[PDB]
UniProtKB/Swiss-Prot annotation, chain A:
It is linked to Short-rib thoracic dysplasia 11 with or without polydactyly: A form of short-rib thoracic dysplasia, a group of autosomal recessive ciliopathies that are characterized by a constricted thoracic cage, short ribs, shortened tubular bones, and a 'trident' appearance of the acetabular roof. Polydactyly is variably present. Non-skeletal involvement can include cleft lip/palate as well as anomalies of major organs such as the brain, eye, heart, kidneys, liver, pancreas, intestines, and genitalia. It comes from Homo sapiens (Human). It comes from the Eukaryota. This is Cytoplasmic dynein 2 intermediate chain 2. Belongs to the dynein light intermediate chain family.
UniProtKB/Swiss-Prot annotation, chain B:
High expression in heart, liver, brain and pancreas; moderate in placenta, skeletal muscle and kidney; low in lung, prostate, testis, small intestine and colon. Isoform 1 expression is up-regulated in 64% hepatocellular carcinoma (HCC) patients. The keyword Transport applies. It comes from the Eukaryota. It holds the Pfam family Robl_LC7. Acts as one of several non-catalytic accessory components of the cytoplasmic dynein 1 complex that are thought to be involved in linking dynein to cargos and to adapter proteins that regulate dynein function. Cytoplasmic dynein 1 acts as a motor for the intracellular retrograde motility of vesicles and organelles along microtubules. One of its GO terms (biological process) is microtubule-based movement. One of its GO terms (cellular component) is cilium. It is found in: Cytoplasm, Cytoskeleton. GO terms for molecular function: dynein intermediate chain binding; identical protein binding; microtubule motor activity. This is Dynein light chain roadblock-type 1. Keywords: Acetylation, Cytoplasm, Cytoskeleton, Dynein, Microtubule, Motor protein, Transport. Belongs to the GAMAD family. Homodimer. The cytoplasmic dynein 1 complex consists of two catalytic heavy chains (HCs) and a number of non-catalytic subunits presented by intermediate chains (ICs), light intermediate chains (LICs) and light chains (LCs); the composition seems to vary in respect to the IC, LIC and LC composition. The heavy chain homodimer serves as a scaffold for the probable homodimeric assembly of the respective non-catalytic subunits. The ICs and LICs bind directly to the HC dimer and the LCs assemble on the IC dimer. Interacts with DYNLRB2. Interacts with DYNC1I1 and DYNC1I2.
Length: 46, 93
């Protein structure tokens, strides 16, 4: 005959943002040098 | 001795210059102007390497014996050797 009223509640939760990324690239530039440290005719005496 | 023989060759009516290429395309003696001295020495060094390889490729038991190049302007002859070759240029006219 005794009806008791009760109130229930569950705990809340917490989320968080995040990200993923594959490997990254970057540019590059090269110029080949053309040095010619060469004389005309060295008179050798080997 | 050899200096006189080179002059002797130079005196020949055909010969227009002599270059003694020693250090892998860098000459040590020349009877020509500086631009030509280096021009011929360098270019012919590259070529003779090709010519000697060509002989080894066409037959694996032979080396170069001689090469001749002819052109409208002039003609160039080279012979191979153990250490280094020699360039002679003539006027075919």
């Amino acid at each position: 005959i005794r009806w008791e009223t009760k109130s229930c509640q569950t705990a809340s939760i917490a989320t968080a943002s995040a990200s993923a990324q594959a490997r990254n690239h970057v540019d590059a530039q090269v110029q080949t040098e053309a040095p010619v440290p060469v004389s005309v005719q060295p008179p050798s005496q080997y | 001795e050899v200096e006189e023989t080179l002059k002797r060759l130079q005196s020949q009516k055909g010969v227009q210059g002599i270059i003694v290429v020693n250090t892998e395309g860098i000459p040590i003696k020349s009877t020509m102007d500086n631009p030509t001295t280096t021009q011929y020495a360098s270019l012919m060094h590259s070529f003779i390497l090709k010519a000697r390889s060509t002989v080894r490729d066409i037959d694996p038991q032979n080396d170069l014996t001689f090469l001749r190049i002819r052109s409208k302007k002039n003609e160039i002859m080279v012979a191979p050797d153990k250490d280094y070759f020699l360039i002679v240029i003539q006027n075919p006219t």
